[PDB]
Structures are given as C-alpha cells and as structure tokens.
Amino acid sequence: SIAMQTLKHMPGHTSREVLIIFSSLTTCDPSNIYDLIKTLKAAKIRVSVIGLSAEVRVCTVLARETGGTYHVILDESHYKELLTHHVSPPPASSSSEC
Amino acid sequence: MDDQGCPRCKTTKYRNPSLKLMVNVCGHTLCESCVDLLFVRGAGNCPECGTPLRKSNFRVQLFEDPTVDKEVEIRKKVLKIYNKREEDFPSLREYNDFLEEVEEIVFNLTNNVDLDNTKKKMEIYQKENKDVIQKNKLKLTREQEELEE
Amino acid sequence: MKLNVDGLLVYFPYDYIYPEQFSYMRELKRTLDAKGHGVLEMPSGTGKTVSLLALIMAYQRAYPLEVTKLIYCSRTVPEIEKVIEELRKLLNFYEKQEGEKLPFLGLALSSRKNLCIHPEVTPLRFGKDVDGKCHSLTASYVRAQYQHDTSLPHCRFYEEFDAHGREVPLPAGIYNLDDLKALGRRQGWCPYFLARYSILHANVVVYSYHYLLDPKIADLVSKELARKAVVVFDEAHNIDNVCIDSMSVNLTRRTLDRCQGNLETLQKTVLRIKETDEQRLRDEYRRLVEGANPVLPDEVLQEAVPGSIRTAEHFLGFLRRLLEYVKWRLRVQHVVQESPPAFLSGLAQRVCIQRKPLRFCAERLRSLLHTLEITDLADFSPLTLLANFATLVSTYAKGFTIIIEPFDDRTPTIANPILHFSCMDASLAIKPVFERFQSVIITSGTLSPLDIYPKILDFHPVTMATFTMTLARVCLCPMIIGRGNDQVAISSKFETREDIAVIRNYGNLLLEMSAVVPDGIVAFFTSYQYMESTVASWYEQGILENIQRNKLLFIETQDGAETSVALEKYQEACENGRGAILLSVARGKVSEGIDFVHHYGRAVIMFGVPYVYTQSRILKARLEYLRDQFQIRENDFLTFDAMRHAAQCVGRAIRGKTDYGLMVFADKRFARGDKRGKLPRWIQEHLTDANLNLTVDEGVQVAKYFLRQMAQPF
Amino acid sequence: LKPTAVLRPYQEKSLRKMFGNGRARSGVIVLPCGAGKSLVGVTAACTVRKRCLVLGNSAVSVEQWKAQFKMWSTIDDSQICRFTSDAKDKPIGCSVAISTYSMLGHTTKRSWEAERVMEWLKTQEWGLMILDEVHTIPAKMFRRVLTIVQAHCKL
Amino acid sequence: SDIIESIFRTYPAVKMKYAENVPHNMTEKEFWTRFFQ
Amino acid sequence: NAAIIKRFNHHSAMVLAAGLRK
Amino acid sequence: RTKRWEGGYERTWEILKE
Ligand code: SF4
Ligand SMILES: [Zn+2]
Ligand SMILES: [Zn+2]
C-alpha cells in the first residue's frame, strides 16, 4: 500500500513494478490482502516476490494473480541468478499498452 | 432411590439405594416405617386401599412401576399354567395363541377382578394338572437350569 | 490417452500419468479376472480414483455381461461430490473419445438431510428433523389425506415423482447431489426418491460406507439384482471400526427417561385411538397373526409371527416390563460388568421376557407405530432405539457384549449410568457384502499391513499389493524425531508422557517448526487432557507465547461448531500473511473429517504413538475378543490400531494435485523395527535412517532444506 | 538417575569406558569441575545400584554431594547420610554414606559416637567407593582410607 | 505503554473497559495487573 | 483451565477479525 | 531396564576400512 500510494500517481507509459525480498514467512496485515491484490492488478503494478527459505501462499497468489513471479532462494547462486534475471525488463503482457 | 417413596415415608429413599421397597398383593409400596403401623392395627391391611393381607406378604423389589410389580407377581403365578411346550402344537398359531389369552389374563388381572380369571384357571387346571403341567414342570425347571448355566 | 493395460487398451483423459497408476490398474484388474475380492493400498486419492473408474469402466464396457454395475463408497459426501464430478469428467472425455453418447448412468446417493428440496423441511438442518418430516410428508396417511385433496401441506415433489418421475426413468448422464437437487427442482421430483429409484436403472452408484454397512439403507441399495456387481471401498481403512460402531448401540438414563415419556405418549395415542376407533387398526392384526427399518441383516431378519405380543396392550406391557428391567439393570450400582448371555438370561429370569417375542420388538413397534399414525419418529427415536436394541440382543450376541457403566462416557463419574451393547467383529456384520457381491476391493491410504484385515474381516484376498507414489521429485517427506535437543529420549511412554522435558521438547520442536514451516501447520495430540496439560505447561512457560507470537494458534475441541469456526479462521489465517497453527487430538472428529492440502496443513506433527486408554471397557472387550476368537495378540492389535490411526491422521497431508507435504513423528517408537514394518510401505520406503532418528534440531534443519528443495518447479 | 539428569557425550564416553562390560572397572576419571564430575559419580552409583560410599575433601564438598544426589537421583534425603563430626544423620540408619578423608583417615582417638558408625562402615562391604579430588589421596593419611574401608570397586 | 495499547487495540473488552475505567489517580501498571491477574 | 485455550483462541480469532476491515 | 553401557565400548575406529 505504501508503494501503491506512490506508484498510483506514476504515468501510464512507465512500467510500475515492485520487488519483494520476503524473509519471515509470517507477516502482519491490517486488512484482507486480496483487495490490495485486486487493486494492484487494476493499478497495473507488476509485483514479483522472492522468498528466502519460504514458499508462502499469499506470495504465491500475489505473484501469479498479478502476473509476476514468485521464486525461492535455493542457494546463493539461485539468489544471484534470480536478482540478475529481475534486471531484465519485464516482457509486455497482452494486457499492457504502449 | 430416584422415586420419592412410600405415600407416607418418602424421605429415606433419596438418601441411599440400600433401602428397598416392598411389594404386596395389594400392589402398594410399603416399608418398615409404614409396615410397623400396619401391624399395630388391622394386622395386615393396606393403608389407603384397606385390602387385608393373609400374612406379611412382603417381598423385596426394586421397580418403581407398581404395575410391573403386580404383572411380574401375576406372571410368575400364571407361568404355572398354559406353559406347555411347542412340541404340543403342530400349528404355528398355537405356539402363541394361548399366549394371547394368557397375556390378556396377566394384564387384565392387574386391574380387573380375578373372578373369571380364577374360574378359567381352575377349569383348565382340572385338565392341565393331569399330564401337561407335570411334564412342563420338568421341562421348565430343566430349561431354567439351562438358562442359569 | 490409450493405456496398454493387461486386459485391454484403456482410454484415459490425461496425456501423462505416473508409472504406479499402470501397476495399480493392472493389479486391480486381477480381482475382476479372478472373480474375487482383494485388498490394496495407494496414497493418491484422485489418481487411484480416476484410474479405478477408467479400469472398471473399460472392463464394464468390455464385459458388461460379467459386471452389471459398479458400487463405489467413500469416506464422506464432500469427497463423494468430488469423485462423482471426476466420473462426469471421465464420461465427458469418454463421450468425446467415442464421439457419441452411450447408454450409461451414474449418480451419488445421500441422506434426505442434504438430498432434499421441500420448502417445509428446507429450513430444518438437523438430519433426524428433516428425515422425520420427510417420512411424515411421504407417510401413507399424508398421501391418503393428499388423495382426499383436503387442505394439506404435502410433498408435491413426491406425488409428481410417484406419478411421473416413476413413470419415466432418467436415460443417461452423471448427476451430482447439487445437480440432482436442481434436476429434482426443475422436474418437480424428490431427488432422494428419484435417486433411489434411479438405482434400478443406473450403472454406477456412489454413497458412503454407512449406506452399505447399516442393513436398513444397505438392503434397499444392495438388492439381489446386484448379484453380479462389483463393490469398491476407496478409503475404508477403518471399515472394522465403522462396521462395529454401526452395529453397537448405547443406552442411557436420559434415554430411558425419554423412552418413558415416549411410552406415555404412546399410551395417550392408544387411548385416543381406542376412544376413536381401534377396529380399523386391527386390520394389521390379521397380517401380524398370519406373519426407519431394523438394523438386523438380511439373513438375520425374518417375517416370523411376533409371538405373544399380539395386541397394543401386550406390546406396551411387554415394552413396560423390558423398560423397567433395563432401567433396573442400568441403575444398578456396581462395577462395570459384561453380561452377553447373562443379560438375556437375566431378562428371562428377572422379568420373564423371552427372546422369541422380544426378537420381534422392532418389527411390531414399526407396525404398531405405523398403524398409530404417529406425527413423526424424531421424538420417538429413543424408544425405537430401545426396541431395536431389544430385538438385536435377543436375536444374537455372538459378536457382541452388554456393558453396564454407572456413569456417562468422557467423564470420571456422573449420576447418569449407561449401558452398551458393544459389537466386537466386522466379519459377521460385513459377511453379506462379500457373500452376495462377486468382488469386493478394499482400497485405502495410510493402510497398516494388509494381512491383519483377513483376520478381522472374513475374506480371501486375490490381491495383496502396496503401492508407493512415483514422481520425478519426492513430493512427500516422512521423518521421525526420537530425541530432544536436551539429549533426552522423546518417547511418549505412559509414565514419560507427562514428563515436563518431553512436553518442553514438543513445545520447542513446535515453536521452531511452526516458525520455519510456511502457511498452515497442524499437530496431533493423544488426548484433550494431555493436550490441555501440554498447552497449560506451555502457557506457564514462554513456549506458548513465543509460538503465538511467531504464528497464530488454534486448538480443536469436542464442539463441531467451535472447531469449524476455528478451522475456517485457521484456513483464513493461512490465506492471509498471518498464518495459523492447528492443535488437535488424533482421535478427534476433526482429524477424520478434515482434508489437508497445500498451505492447509502443509506439515503434520504427531506427538507420540496414539494409544487409547487401555483400561477402557470398550477396548478391553474388543481386544480380548480378537485374541479369544481371532487370536490376535493384545499389543499386536493395539499397536496396529495406533499405527493405523497415526498414519490416517498424518498421511492425509497428501491428497492430490501433486502438492508437497511434511510428516514428522515425534517418537522414537515409530522408528522401532516392528513399528516401521507396521507403517505403510510408501511411508516406510520414503523413511530412512537419515530421518529415522532425527534430533529436534535435525528435524528443523532437514525440514528447512526440504522446503527449499520443494519450492522450485518440477 | 531421575530423567531430569542430562548426560553429555564426554560424560557418556567416560562412563562407557568405566563400564566396559557388566562389571565395573576401577580407576580414575579426570573431568573439570564445570564438566559435571559430580553427575558422573552419581550416575556411577545409580549404575552400580549397590551400597556406595562417597568421600569428599571437605564438609562443603560433602554438602555438595548430598545436594547433587538429591538433585540427580530418585534417592530420598533420609536414605543419604553425611557421616561427619560437625553433623549427624544416623549413618547406620541408611545405605548411602558421605564423609571425608580427615574423618575416616583420622590417626588420633575417635569419639565414641563416631566409632560406632566407623565400625559399622568397617564391617560393611561397599559396592562402589567414590573418591573426589583424588590428587590428595596419595597422602600418607588419606591413602590409609583405602585399607580401612572394604570396597568392591573404587572410582 | 505498548503493552496496554496493544491489548486495548486488540481486545474489545479492554477497549470498552479502558474507555470507561480510564486511569485516574492511579498507575497504569495497576490497570495492567487488573487485566492479567 | 479451558479458559486459557478459549482465551488464546479468542485472541487469535480477534486478531484475525481485527485484520478484516468491514 | 538396563543402561546403554552394558553392551560395550563404542569402538568407533573399527568403522574404518582399507
Ligand atoms: S418427499 Fe422428497 S422433497 Fe419431500 S421432504 Fe422427502 S425428500 Fe424432500
Ligand atoms: Zn393396592
Ligand atoms: Zn405407607
């Protein structure tokens, strides 16, 4: 939400994105994340989660529903590889406009 | 134990299950606290019903239903009659035919007078005492021992 | 996807299936080929289900003259609802593969509680209430009153079904309960009675085990027409306990009090009848003298003349005599005693009630109750139970015992004595299924060694094969923790079970595991007392606070509503970032009812070997009978039931969709050579010395590694 | 040994080496004070399961041993006695005895009361004789204790 | 402060009780004790 | 004794209900 | 219930082979 309150005012031509480095699988929340997820899809904010030693449900749905990807650190090389992969520009979705 | 008790002394029954109710021909719940008064006057007369008792006629029973008490007492007596075994009858109806009137007699005797019942019992006793009662007594006592064993 | 099965090429919908499915199908085929029953085990639900349906359908299409119908039974309606949808999917594929429709019909049956559409009973939610009203709505007097066309609330769906629904049988298709209700609504026909009728013109029928174990419902569905049909159990690992439980009956102080109130209601009804007219009811007396439904099986029940009970007064008197004797025998203050023959002999000696008339107690009761035009059986139920018990105990007791307990169960002592007619064998009770049907297949998961079953149930297994999951990755990871990090044995010995260190080791283990395991985790305890004691000990310590702080925690109770809400909140907590922990008793109803899936019970913790209190009279009677009659050792069967129940509660973590799960056992007992052999083959083969005697720390480390290895795609 | 007692690998090794078979082997075990030498001694007694005598170099040690025995073993306080001039527990009344080299090894005249216990100690045979801080044992007086007390195995 | 505030924000009973029984001429640690005692 | 479980589960229930805005 | 030491020494070195 703090990111969305910032990225919502961004122009439409720019790819709005968020990279989440998730460490502790438990995370407190003041409201149902599904509404926020639906809002992220509507806000066209690409969200991709990277989980460290955790395969979380909310991160799974958040990524795949938003179109982003959720990955988990297999080892240091996997972590290096995943961040290196995220450096690539995002491939345009059929829902994305120029 | 759960029931209140005798129409007069309905208090010790709640205290313990060791005290048991007594049954009588009158089908009336009685116990020592009440029974002691029945000996000082009348010497064997039901308190509310007034019916006389030939002797003490007290027996231990643990049933709250006085109808069952009477019915069991009546049952036990009637079982001495009509109790011939199944081999006596070839037809399926006969196996339970007499049991119908027997159960009617037993049930009706709990409420109605035994005038016709005793007459019928006597009229059949005159016939059944000859052979079938003699034979069924053996078979009944034998099968009763088999039930015990 | 054509499968080169041993007997024939089998069409299958999915382009890819795992190797073990071919084995399971070609192995199961042996039961068909050999024309005989058998037993086998397979972890996956959906895989074994779809492969079973494909195999049996192809076999039925190949040999319709040999097998007329397929009877499938599963744990519960929610599972049955999914299975029948999988059959529809298979039929949709088959129709697409064939390119044309075929004369095939399959349907799922259910009780009137769910399978009903009448507006007057729709607001009712208790099964006995819906059944009682439905019975009343369908009753001959209501039907007659309906035929009189007087103002009457009647089941139009029944009248239209009896008139038209009976006249035209449904041609083909698959009808799920929700679809069957909609169909019934659209057609204006009773779904229950329509489904029951459709059994006469259907190839596949689906219902739970009690629809086959309880003779009243089972007889109507297991008619002699199915003399050459196949019956299959998919998850009846506890078929013995369910069968015995379905045969066992419990009587109590309040039950007798309700029976007495019912008896007074019957008397008032008899008076109302006698003051109105009894001669019309004596039309039944003719057929009775000539000579809900009883739980007595086909070979035990007979239409023999009821004996001396020839009138309502005789029956009511006979019932009074028995009720007084039962109350007397129940209210007796003494130690718990078993009187299998002595109760009946005592009944004959104490109140002179012979077994012969008593045998017809339920038969006469239903006849009398029917002629009495009673409102509904819902309130009379205790009296019907007493009458059922009375005829049952008087008919046969070879596989039963009478137990008298001065107090209610689940309590140390209460002034509410109870009596049990505890059953003790499944073989004689299930005997009609194996005797009538040409083949019986005992399929299940978490199934303890198969060779015990031919002892508890009389069967000659054609198949004795235990299958194990075949996958590119080890989707399941069983592990046994035998030692605490405090260098102490973690065994749940009866004297050691209460040890604060073992309790602390479980709390530390759960604290660490709940912190490292993502989403939903579940832990099973041996009993509520130990669970509460454990939780209380963890509450006195920081353990419970650290756990709750790390992740939300929920605990199950005997209350279905509270546990349902807690479980829904636990699941909803797992959906959100909060996550949740569920603590439950292995024997609890929630464990036998809940299904674990990805992120919903991702890891299952078992604290100790689940052994029931060995002083319980039920266990005593059951265990001694198995040793006396079936010769199974006390510790052998007691361990088998503990191993089975543990695997059942713990193995549910794997159900389908190829989702990973963890199974950690916190007791070195499970690692013992015998316990390992009693453990199911798929668990036993995935289990290994590296994870056979892990320390609490080692378990957390191996779990964390396994989770990292499972998160990537296959 | 009550399950509250935790045994470390080095402790287990030393005990396994001392109990190489069903017969206890006599000898010396060297363990730091922080390594729980007291627990090993208590464990050895629990292993031997026979009447044993513990001797400390000081009354403070005797107190420490009593606490450790109660702390680690199922034995009750009455079953343990601290045969000492400063304190009395009626040693003859119980099986486990605790004392010091200064008391048993005493070269001068014994008090009449202490003589009663000592004669009982002399006549009884000790299954296990635990000696703490044995570096003092080679002393001319302390070594006499080994000739005074009759013990099957001495640790 | 966070102890009472987290409880007050989380539980309805404390939320209502603290609004009506707000600390006056007393120490907040007493209110904490009244809850956990 | 059961109140501890009831309260702990009420707490987790209220934390979840608080985490669900109307 | 006998203790773990009744069996014998650990002989850890015997696991090595050439
Ligand atoms: S007759 Fe049919 S619609 Fe009416 S109550 Fe029974 S099941 Fe429901
Ligand atoms: Zn009278
Ligand atoms: Zn009186």
Q: What is the 3-state secondary structure (H, E, C) of C458-495?
A: CCCCCCEEECCCCCCCCCEEEEEEEECCCCCECCCCCC
The Cα C301–Cα C279 span in angstroms is 29
Count the neighbouring beta carbons within 10 Å of the beta carbon of residue B89: 14
Strand partners, B60: B22
CA–CA separation, D117 vs D103, rounded Å?
11
- Residues C572, F16 contacting (CB under 8 angstroms): yes
Separation between Cα atoms, residue B116 and residue B107, nearest integer Å: 14
To test the pocket of ligand 1, the residue of C115, C134, C196 to mutate (highest count of ligand atoms within 8 Å of its CB) is C134
Looking at all shown ligands, the one closest to residue C110's CA atom is: 1
Within 8 A of C578 by CB-CB distance, chain A residues are 26-29
Q: Say yes or no: D16 contacts chain G, CB-CB below 8 A.
A: yes
Cα gap C252→C331, rounded to integer Å: 9
Three-class secondary structure of residue C337 per DSSP: strand
Q: Do A29 and F19 touch (CB under 8 A)?
A: yes
Cα gap C614→C638, rounded to integer Å = 9
Q: How far apart are CA D105 and CA G16, in angstroms?
A: 49
Longest dimension (CA), chain G: 38
- Give the chains touching B; criterion: ≥3 Cβ pairs < 8 Å: C
Shortest-distance atom of ligand 1 to CA C192: 7
Q: Given its phi and psi angles, is residue C328 left (phi above 0), alpha (psi -120 to 50 degrees) or beta?
A: alpha
Experimental technique behind these coordinates: cryo-EM
- Measured CA to CA, the distance from residue C31 to residue C23 in angstroms comes to 13
Residue C389 CB coordination number (10 Å): 23
Identify the CA nearest to D82 among candidates D39, D112, D70: D70
Range of the domain at C639: 476-711
Q: Does F13 touch chain E (CB under 8 A)?
A: no
Using an 8 Å Cβ cutoff, are D149 and D121 in contact?
A: yes
Task: Give the Å distances, CA to CA, from C141 to A25, C135, C274.
Answer: 64, 11, 18
Query: Within 13 Å of residue B134, how many CA atoms lie on the same side as its CB?
Result: 5
Q: Which chains touch C (3 or more CB pairs under 8 A)?
A: A, B, D, F
According to DSSP, the residues that pair with C167 across neighbouring strands are: none
Query: How many residues comprise chain D?
Result: 155
Residue numbers in F near A28 (CB within 8 A)? 19
Q: Which of F12, F14, F16 to mutate to test the interface with E (most CBs of E within 10 A)?
A: F14
CA–CA distance, C182 with C193 (Å, rounded to integer): 14
Ligand 1 site, CB within 6 A? C 112, 116-118, 121, 134, 137-138, 155, 157-158, 190, 192-193
Which distant-in-sequence residues (6+ apart) come within 8 Å of B106 by Cβ?
B71, B74, B75, B78, C317
Instruction: Please report, for residues A2, C402, C405, the alpha-carbon distance to residue C337 in angstroms, rounded to integers and kept in the order given.
Output: 71, 8, 8
R_g (Cα) of chain A, nearest Å: 14
On the 0-12 / 13-18 / 19+ scale of CB atoms within 10 A, A26 is middle
Question: Rounded to whole angstroms, how far apart are CA atoms D56 and D69?
Answer: 14
- For residues C147, C152, C153 and C159, what is the CA-based torsion angle, rounded to 10 degrees? 10
Cα–Cα distance for residue pair G1/C580, rounded to 1 Å: 42
For residue C578, give the CATH number of its domain: 3.40.50.300
C-alpha C320: how far from chain center: 34
- Cα(C28)–Cα(C34) distance, integer angstroms: 10
| C585 touches C527 (CB < 8 A) | yes
Say if CB C367 and CB C128 are below 8 A apart. Answer: no
Residue of F nearest to C575 (CA): F16
Which of C544, C555, C573 lies closest to F16 in CB terms?
Answer: C573
Quote the CA–CA distance of C641 and C447 in Å, as a whole number: 10
- Measure C136 CA to ligand 1 centroid, in angstroms: 10
Return all residues near C556 (Cβ < 8 A) that are at least 6 apart: C563, C566, C567, C582, C583, C584, C585, C588, C590
Cα distance between residue C380 and residue C261, in whole Å = 9
Using alpha carbons, select from C672, C544, C525, C683 the residue that is nearest to residue C607. C525
Q: Tell me which residue has tokens 């916190």.
A: C666
For residue C446, give the nearest of C212, C245, C261, C610 by alpha carbon.
C610
CA nearest to C11, candidates C129, C133, C95: C95
> Is residue B20 within 8 angstroms of chain C, CB to CB?
no
Query: What Å distances lie between residue D106 and B124, C284, D96, D134, CA to CA?
Result: 110, 108, 21, 17
How many angstroms separate the CA atoms of A15 and A47, rounded?
Answer: 11
Whether the Cβ atoms of residue D43 and residue D54 lie closer than 8 Å to each other: no
The Cα C297–Cα C293 span in angstroms is 11
What separation in Å is there between the alpha carbon of C386 and the centre of ligand 1?
Answer: 27
Cβ neighbours around B77 below 10 Å, total? 12
Here the tokens at position C595 are 């299904």
Distance CA(C595)–CA(C607), nearest Å, equals 19
- Please identify which residue in the block is written with the tokens 């045979």: D125
Place of tokens 């005798």: B6
Which among D61, D59, D54 has a CA at the least distance from the CA of D33? D61
- Measured CA to CA, the distance from residue C238 to residue C592 in angstroms comes to 10
Contact yes or no for C682/C467 (Cβ under 8 A): yes
The residue among D4, D144, D16, D18 whose CA lies nearest residue D74 is D4
- What's the token pair of residue E9? 């924000």
Beta strands in chain D (DSSP E): 52-56, 80-82, 96-100, 125-131, 150-154
In degrees and rounded to multiples of 5, residue C618 shows phi and psi of -60, -50
For a substitution probing ligand 1, which of C111, C117, C135 has the most ligand atoms within 8 Å of its CB? C117
Cβ contacts of F19 on chain C, cutoff 8 Å:
576, 578
Q: Name the 3-class secondary structure at C173.
A: strand
3-class secondary structure, C684: helix
Distance in angstroms (rounded) separating the CA atoms of residues B66 and B24: 10
**Chain A residues with beta carbon closer than 8 angstroms to that of F21:** 30-32
What tokens appear for D55 in the block? Answer: 């001797």
CB C329 within 8 A of CB C404: yes
Residues C453 and C30 sit within 8 Å (Cβ to Cβ): no
C177 Cα to the center of ligand 1, angstroms: 14
Q: Do A54 and C518 count as a contact with CB atoms less than 8 A apart? A: yes
Residue contact A33–C710, C-beta within 8 A: no
Q: Which residues pair with C466 in a beta bridge?
A: C41
CA distance C420 to C402: 6
Q: Which helix (H) or strand (E) holds C566?
A: helix C560-575
Among C611, C636, C622, residue whose Cα is nearest residue C338: C622
Rounded Cα distance between C338 and C621, Å, is 8
Torsion angle, alpha carbons of B28, B31, B34, B40, to 10: 100
Which are the contacts of C273, defined by CB distance < 8 A and separation ≥ 6?
A: C281, C312, C372
From the CA of C118, the nearest ligand is 1
**What is each CA distance from C709 to A48, A61, A80, C425, C703, in whole angstroms?**
20, 20, 17, 46, 10
Contact at 8 Å (CB) between C486 and C502? no
Nearest C-alpha to atom 8 of ligand 1 is from which residue? C116
Q: Is residue C308 classed as helix, strand or coil in its secondary structure?
A: coil
Chain F contact probe: residue of C537, C543, C555 with most F CBs at under 10 A: C555
Breaks in chain E, named by the residue before each, with C–N above 2.5 Å? Answer: none
C643 and C678 Cβ atoms separated by less than 8 Å: yes
Beta partners for C21? none
Enumerate residues 6+ apart whose C-beta is below 8 A from D78: D93, D94
* Residues C121, C129: Cα–Cα separation, whole Å: 8
Distance of CA E10 to the CA centre of its chain: 11
C536, F19: Cβ pair inside 8 Å? no
For ligand 1, what atom is nearest to the CA of residue C115? 7
Measured between alpha carbons, how far is D96 from D83 in angstroms, rounded to an integer?
10
D15: left (phi over 0), alpha (psi -120 to 50) or beta: alpha
Could you identify the residue written with the tokens 């798929």? C682
**If you ran DSSP here, which 8-state letter would residue C231 be given?**
E
Task: Give the Cα separation of D29 and D155 in Å (integer).
Answer: 7
Cβ within 8 Å, pair C487-D4: no
Q: CA D71 → CA D6, D39, D64, distances in Å?
A: 12, 9, 10
